[PDB]
UniProtKB/Swiss-Prot annotation, chain A:
Name of encoding gene: ESR1
Free-text domain note: Composed of three domains: a modulating N-terminal domain, a DNA-binding domain and a C-terminal ligand-binding domain. The modulating domain, also known as A/B or AF-1 domain has a ligand-independent transactivation function. The C-terminus contains a ligand-dependent transactivation domain, also known as E/F or AF-2 domain which overlaps with the ligand binding domain. AF-1 and AF-2 activate transcription independently and synergistically and act in a promoter- and cell-specific manner. AF-1 seems to provide the major transactivation function in differentiated cells.
Effect of residue 57 to H: In ESTRR; results in highly reduced activity
Species per Swiss-Prot/TrEMBL record: Homo sapiens
Protein name: Estrogen receptor
Function of the protein: Nuclear hormone receptor. The steroid hormones and their receptors are involved in the regulation of eukaryotic gene expression and affect cellular proliferation and differentiation in target tissues. Ligand-dependent nuclear transactivation involves either direct homodimer binding to a palindromic estrogen response element (ERE) sequence or association with other DNA-binding transcription factors, such as AP-1/c-Jun, c-Fos, ATF-2, Sp1 and Sp3, to mediate ERE-independent signaling.
Subunit details: Binds DNA as a homodimer. Can form a heterodimer with ESR2. Interacts with FOXC2, MAP1S, SLC30A9, UBE1C and NCOA3 coactivator. Interacts with PELP1, the interaction is enhanced by 17-beta-estradiol, the interaction increases ESR1 transcriptional activity. Interacts with EP300; the interaction is estrogen-dependent and enhanced by CITED1. Interacts with CITED1; the interaction is estrogen-dependent. Interacts with NCOA5 and NCOA6 coactivators. Interacts with NCOA7; the interaction is a ligand-inducible. Interacts with PHB2, and UBE1C. Interacts with AKAP13. Interacts with CUEDC2.
Curated annotation (Swiss-Prot), chain B:
Effect seen on changing residue 218 to A: Reduces PELP1-mediated activation of transcriptional activity
Whole-protein coverage range: 309 to 546 of 595
Effect of residue 51 to E: Has higher transcriptional activity in the absence of wild type ER. Inhibits transcriptional activity when coexpressed with the wild type receptor
Subcellular location: Nucleus; Golgi apparatus; Cell membrane
Effect of residue 220 to A: Abolishes interaction with NCOA1, NCOA2 and NCOA3
Segments of this protein annotated with the region Interaction with AKAP13: 1-227
Modification comment: Phosphorylated by cyclin A/CDK2 and CK1. Phosphorylation probably enhances transcriptional activity. Self-association induces phosphorylation. Phosphorylated by LMTK3 in vitro. Glycosylated; contains N-acetylglucosamine, probably O-linked.
Involvement in disorder: Estrogen resistance: A disorder characterized by partial or complete resistance to estrogens, in the presence of elevated estrogen serum levels. Clinical features include absence of the pubertal growth spurt, delayed bone maturation, unfused epiphyses, reduced bone mineral density, osteoporosis, continued growth into adulthood and very tall adult stature. Glucose intolerance, hyperinsulinemia and lipid abnormalities may also be present.
Keywords: Activator, Cell membrane, Cytoplasm, Disease variant, DNA-binding, Glycoprotein, Golgi apparatus, Lipid-binding, Lipoprotein, Membrane, Metal-binding, Methylation, Nucleus, Osteoporosis, Palmitate, Phosphoprotein, Receptor, Steroid-binding, Transcription, Transcription regulation, Transmembrane, Ubl conjugation, Zinc, Zinc-finger
Gene name of the encoded protein: ESR1
Organism of provenance: Homo sapiens (Human)
Region (Transactivation AF-2): 3-227
Post-translational modification Phosphotyrosine, affected residues: 218
Protein name: Estrogen receptor
Amino acid sequence: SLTADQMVSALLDAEPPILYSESMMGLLTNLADRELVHMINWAKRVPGFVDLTLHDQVHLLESAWLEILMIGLVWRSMEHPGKLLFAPNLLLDRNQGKSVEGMVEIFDMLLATSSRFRMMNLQGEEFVCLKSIILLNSGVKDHIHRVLDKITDTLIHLMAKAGLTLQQQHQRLAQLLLILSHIRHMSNKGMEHLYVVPSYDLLLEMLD
Amino acid sequence: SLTADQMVSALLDAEPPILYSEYFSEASMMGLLTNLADRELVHMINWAKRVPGFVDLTLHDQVHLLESAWLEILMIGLVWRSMEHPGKLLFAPNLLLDRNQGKSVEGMVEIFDMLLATSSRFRMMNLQGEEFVCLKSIILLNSGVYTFTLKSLEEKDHIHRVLDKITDTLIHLMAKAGLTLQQQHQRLAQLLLILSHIRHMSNKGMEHLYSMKVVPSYDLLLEMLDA
Ligand SMILES: CN(C)CCOc1ccc([C@@H]2c3ccc(O)cc3CC3(CC3)N2C(=O)c2ccccc2)cc1
Ligand SMILES: CN(C)CCOc1ccc([C@@H]2c3ccc(O)cc3CC3(CC3)N2C(=O)c2ccccc2)cc1
């Protein structure tokens, strides 16, 4: 029932805080573990999410959690070319990733996504819609699609309010959604590198 | 340069044929599927060369895009062929498999279930042939663009122009079908979100192929593209 402006306001308010770092992999694992709690707090404030069953809420988070960690990292790193801002006290370039096998490949995918965000001048209002789509789309039922349809309407609203023509609205919408396919691919490659997954019980306890 | 009408027409004429298996036992099934996929790959090359704008790229970039997209294109073709056969995967007209036939190999049933679910999603959306060939062209151009110099920049800018062109073509098809603007935007998003699941399936399918101990080599794809 929310309007597009009210949808945007809710998602912006819900944004998780930036956490700080507490052997490089140990710091990153500890950081991701602490970020998960705040992610679940964010998810509960995504309009429509808590109308789902608790079993379905966990399934969506089980499928989306790493994608959400990555798009958050990519957003944070967007104005630091060639570097990944894991935390304000953990800025790493790709040279540091060469120690572990298979790290630099995922590092490079994340950097290229950050460069893409930079070239499209992605705005914060668009970013929080994108993150909400990952949450609802990744594990997907009728309720989920009309929440997804509402987020789509909100993105179209933001682009028209920004002055884009109808054609540019369609084109930018498509461009943003095609990036989500690459984020899923990065998440899959990231899962493989990590093989680690938050248990159903752990996610359930965090929700309630 | 093409209109949306002309883009649909070109993609429709570029469609590869539906191929058959040999004219049954679970033991021989992997060999049959591997042979079918190997033959389909040859036709997928010639389809790709006919997707508007693809042959404007360098041959190295064409190989990279196909190397990144080939399994996704095989899977979405399988999902399309199966869309009118609930509960079954139509690998070929004479090779129609159900879930129970997919439990012989470990890990096969998980991917089989995912492919069936996508087929059911296509069915629920009443996906049209004209929208399908657009989605397949998007997979080819989008899947490898984020993993590629001045030449690379011009190539990526070209790809995004062609992808913009296909987006307009999808919108035009939806408007021609009488959808409101809101329904056009919502169906466009619904279509492109399915692409994320198709990438997920192909990642899971690629893992399963490496567990048998596999992929079209660079030389092989180059050899086919470079006529
Ligand atoms: C959850 N527990 C149960 C198990 C741990 O899973 C995790 C999850 C995330 C991480 C880490 C991390 C931390 C914070 C962040 O905001 C984002 C990321 C992203 C990234 C890509 C995935 N990562 C890496 O180190 C990395 C690897 C290879 C290339 C580049 C980066 C580490 C471990
Ligand atoms: C190319 N050579 C060099 C290497 C072999 O690569 C391949 C590639 C594809 C295939 C096959 C196949 C054939 C035709 C088709 O149209 C589609 C598919 C799809 C599918 C999912 C991927 N597959 C499977 O068997 C399968 C596995 C688990 C669940 C369901 C299906 C087999 C081998």
